[PDB]
Amino acid sequence: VANYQIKVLDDGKIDKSATESPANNDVQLKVYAVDANGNIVGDITNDVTITSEATDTNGVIVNASKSTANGDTVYVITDNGSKKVGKETLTVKLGTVTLGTVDVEVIDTTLKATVVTKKADLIELDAADNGDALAKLLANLDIKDQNGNPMVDSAATPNTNEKLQALKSVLSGIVSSDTSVIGSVSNVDNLKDDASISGLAVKKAGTVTLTLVFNEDSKIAPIAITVKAPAA
Ligand SMILES: [Ca+2]
Ligand SMILES: [Ca+2]
Ligand SMILES: [Ca+2]
Ligand SMILES: [Ca+2]
């Protein structure tokens, strides 16, 4: 044996997300022993022990377990409640002897709201709005993710609005210039999620400026949208 090879069968990454496709929930490891001429002379994946640090130091916590099928065992690395993303050094041992080291990576490709822009500067309401400006204010907004992809209410999920939920994930509050016409939203959880969208109820005929304030994490500047809600 010239040396040992730690083989990564997959992409070497573990997606911490809950809804990634295809499912990327493990790292697959094989350990070969090779001769001087580069030839595989043994699959010793079963005879080794794979461990990470005994005490967490980076918030990346994984689990190393064997998986034997038809005399063929693969070391499967799974997530064990990691709170951060990044590299985790795995140490491969034959009893007492360290053979090598491989880095697995925990990632999180979960869709976060990253960009929010307004289309028009003004919106008007009609009878079809049923006295609530939220449905039209939302339609006047464009939400993108980390990948710059549109965040949109999907019809195959009639329970909740993905676009409204994406806005509320980054919104700190909506200030009205006149609470008598439309009330200000201090608690964004009041922007309720149903097939019927509500939260910006019209209490009186009038024109008002709704200012959308976002959290410090998102770094998104305030957005001012004038809303006209005429009477009969
Ligand atoms: Ca996942
Ligand atoms: Ca993987
Ligand atoms: Ca760790
Ligand atoms: Ca839906």
From ligand 3's centre to the CA of 86, what distance in Å? 9
State yes or no: 108 annotated in a binding site: no
Beta-strand relationship, 122-124 and 75-79: unpaired
* Experimental technique used to determine this entry: X-ray
Residue with tokens 């609530």: 132
DSSP, collapsed to helix, strand or coil, labels residue 92 as: strand
From ligand 2's centre to the CA of 76, what distance in Å? 10
Q: In degrees rounded to 5, what are phi and psi of residue 129? A: -80, -15
The residues near 152 (Cβ < 8 Å, ≥ 6 apart) are 143, 162, 163
Distance CA 59, CA 70 (A): 35
* Longest CA span, the chain: 89
167 exposed, middle or buried (CB, 10 Å; 0-12, 13-18, 19+)? buried
In the chain, the N- to C-terminal Cα span, in Å, equals 89
Q: What stretch of H or E contains 137?
A: helix 134-139
State yes or no: 20 annotated in a binding site: yes
Distance CA 71, CA 94 (A): 19
Q: In degrees rounded to 5, what are phi and psi of residue 163? A: -80, -40
Give the other-Cβ count within 10 Å of 36's Cβ: 9
Q: In degrees rounded to 5, what are phi and psi of residue 113? A: -70, 120
Distance CA 232, CA 213 (A): 31
Distance CA 232, CA 230 (A): 7
Beta-strand relationship, 122-124 and 223-229: parallel
- List 105's β-bridge partners, or say none: 13, 87
Cβ atoms of residues 141 and 116 within 8 Å: yes
Cβ atoms of residues 206 and 181 within 8 Å: yes
From ligand 3's centre to the CA of 5, what distance in Å? 23
Task: Indicate which ligand has the atom closest to the C-alpha of 8.
Answer: 2
The closest of 195, 207, 188 to 161, measured between CA atoms, is 195
Neighbours of ion ligand 3 (CB under 5 A): 56, 58, 60
Q: What stretch of H or E contains 168?
A: helix 162-168
Header resolution in angstroms: 2.6
Distance CA 24, CA 191 (A): 34
Half-sphere exposure of 116 (CA within 13 A, CB side): 27
Task: Indicate which ligand has the atom closest to the C-alpha of 109.
Answer: 1
From ligand 2's centre to the CA of 44, what distance in Å? 21
Q: What stretch of H or E contains 134?
A: helix 134-139
State yes or no: 189 annotated in a binding site: no
DSSP structure class, residue 220: P
Neighbours of ion ligand 2 (CB under 5 A): 10-11, 24
Distance CA 105, CA 111 (A): 19
Task: Indicate which ligand has the atom closest to the C-alpha of 23.
Answer: 1
Task: Indicate which ligand has the atom closest to the C-alpha of 103.
Answer: 3
Distance CA 103, CA 154 (A): 37
Distance CA 19, CA 120 (A): 33
The closest of 147, 146, 111, 107 to 11, measured between CA atoms, is 107
State yes or no: 190 annotated in a binding site: no
